């Protein structure tokens, strides 16, 4: 760091960054009296005379379920109408066959999300013990079609469909708008269209590869699924204990004991199993609130990154951000952020201002850099030399208040046009 040292980057790279979000868990349900007891007539009376605990648990579990459903609905809800991919792909050279869905499968899945479908992903025993599993309303197919419409709108209309009606506009101008959004002026994109096309398609291929070679990046969804399944298997194995009572099977002990002593022994056994079921449903509520937090996070991304461009940083991946293509996953959603990142850095000597005619001069948009001989104005995020014209400057004050200024000439764009 020095009072005249600046390092403007000159060569950039688009880079693909994946991001993983556990949008929901497996919708779960536990029939209160059914798990505690296999519908024995004595358990009926005892659990009835116990309290309204099991109805409490049914209400809480159904709340979890319907809230997971609300999550899956709202996280993709930002689609007034299901847009559809235009047949041909003249995307200025941006191969989208991997991200977009194509009729290869009878389903409208995409080539990338197939790796997810296959890599992230004993219930017969649970199915007979009351411990059931409901299915999700938004099925894999409709989730995939929502992702398809989202990507289609994101490609063909930029952000107008997020705000209002979808508006045709080619991908070139869309990238131009986004670059303007991150400072770099359109000139760089339209001067490096083919180069950026190669970079983008190569990066898409490399992320496809990096996912195809190992299934370790798709971490957190696997951890969520394992947490859920381990909770369920703990809830089942819990049945095997004795809690001081005779045996882990009701129908067994109903044989050994007359109604009187069966009453007390089953009082103990039910207190046990019911405390356990309470523990299970409480941990389930807590993980459900955590998943809803991460799902509102996913929604904020899907409505901020995808349908627009987050000026703010590190909310759509590392680096200056451009856009993000969402993709479905079994009980999850993954984003392919395509982030701008400057790569090659050249040193320059900088001037905080300029004294041309005794008055100060300030860069209206860029920065005053130089290599010693000529001073230039440049865009703060991409090396672009420019001669010092009054178009890039606004005079202000004089040559005293400024600190660190340098003397120079500021060319006037009229002199030859004044000679005639």
């Amino acid at each position: 760091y020095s009072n005249n040292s600046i390092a403007i980057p000159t060569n950039f790279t688009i880079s693909v960054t994946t991001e993983i979000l556990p949008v929901s868990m497996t919708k779960t349900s536990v029939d209160c009296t059914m798990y505690i007891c296999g519908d024995s007539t004595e358990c009926s009376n005892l659990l009835l005379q116990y309290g309204s605990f099991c109805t409490q648990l049914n209400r809480a579990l159904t709340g979890i379920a319907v809230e997971q459903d609300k999550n899956t609905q709202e996280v993709f809800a930002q689609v007034k109408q299901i847009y559809k991919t235009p047949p041909i792909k003249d995307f200025g050279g941006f191969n989208f066959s991997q991200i977009l869905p194509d009729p290869s499968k009878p389903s409208k899945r995409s080539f990338i999300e197939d790796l997810l479908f296959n890599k992230v992903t004993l219930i017969c025993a649970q199915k007979f013990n009351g411990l059931t599993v409901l299915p999700p309303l938004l099925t894999d197919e409709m989730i995939a079609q929502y992702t398809s419409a989202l990507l289609a709108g994101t490609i063909t209309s930029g952000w107008t469909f997020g705000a209002g009606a979808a508006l045709q506009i080619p991908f070139a101008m869309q990238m131009a708008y986004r670059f303007n959004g991150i400072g770099v002026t359109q000139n760089v994109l339209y001067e490096n269209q083919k180069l950026i096309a190669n970079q983008f398609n190569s990066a898409i291929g490399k992320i496809q590869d990096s996912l195809s070679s190992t299934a370790s990046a798709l971490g957190k969804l696997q951890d969520v699924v394992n947490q859920n399944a381990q909770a369920l298997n703990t809830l089942v194995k819990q049945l095997s204990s004795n809690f001081g009572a005779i045996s882990s099977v009701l129908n067994d002990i109903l044989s050994r004991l007359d109604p009187p002593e069966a009453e007390v022994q089953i009082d103990r056994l039910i207190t046990g199993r019911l405390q356990s079921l309470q523990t299970y449903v409480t941990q389930q509520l807590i993980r459900a609130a955590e998943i809803r937090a991460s799902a509102n996070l996913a929604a904020t991304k899907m409505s901020e990154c995808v349908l627009g461009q987050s000026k703010r940083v590190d909310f759509c991946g590392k680096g200056y951000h451009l856009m993000s293509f969402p993709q479905s996953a079994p009980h999850g959603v993954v984003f392919l952020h395509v982030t701008y990142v400057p790569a090659q850095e050249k040193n320059f000597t900088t001037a905080p201002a300029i004294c041309h005619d005794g008055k100060a001069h300030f860069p209206r948009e860029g920065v005053f850099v130089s290599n010693g001989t000529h001073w230039f104005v440049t865009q703060r995020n991409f090396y672009e030399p420019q001669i010092i014209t009054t178009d890039n400057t606004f005079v202000s004050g004089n040559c005293d208040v400024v600190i660190g200024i340098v003397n120079n000439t500021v060319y006037d764009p009229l002199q030859p046009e004044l000679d005639s």
Binding site: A125, F128, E141
Partner: protein, 136 residues
């Protein structure tokens, strides 16, 4: 039912995680019976606002509709099977719309008031994700 699990000599009952009794041997004739408790899907009622009607449809969870028999009557051949389970009281329409009542596995139900056929009907169908619209 009849099981294929090869049975060790004198041990009697086969278990699973659940501490229940999964398999047994018939003591009379040494045959290895499998014990599979028949499914019990929770009943779920499908209704419009009772302020509107009093005819409703019943959604059982995933069960073989054969197992389905306090039911008053079973709609004749109109029992529509979903990926979620059997549903009695709804004609399988194909005219897709936006759906109010969630049924699951893409299936949604809604009340329909016709002029001639079932002026008070409760239909279930494949939900349309919306009015498809691609721009040029």
């Amino acid at each position: 039912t009849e099981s294929n699990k090869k049975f060790l000599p004198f041990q009697q009952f086969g278990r699973d995680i659940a501490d229940t009794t999964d398999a047994v041997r018939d003591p009379q004739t040494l045959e290895i019976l499998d014990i599979t408790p028949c499914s019990f899907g929770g009943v779920s009622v499908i209704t419009p606002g009772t302020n509107t009607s009093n005819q409703v449809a019943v959604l059982y969870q995933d069960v073989n509709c054969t197992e389905v028999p306090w039911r008053v009557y079973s709609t004749g051949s109109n029992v529509f099977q979903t990926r979620a389970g059997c549903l009695i009281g709804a004609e399988h329409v194909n005219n897709s719309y936006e759906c109010d009542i969630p049924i699951g596995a893409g299936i949604c139900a809604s009340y329909q008031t016709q002029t001639s056929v079932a002026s008070q009907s409760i239909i279930a169908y494949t939900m349309s994700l919306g009015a498809e619209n691609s721009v040029a």
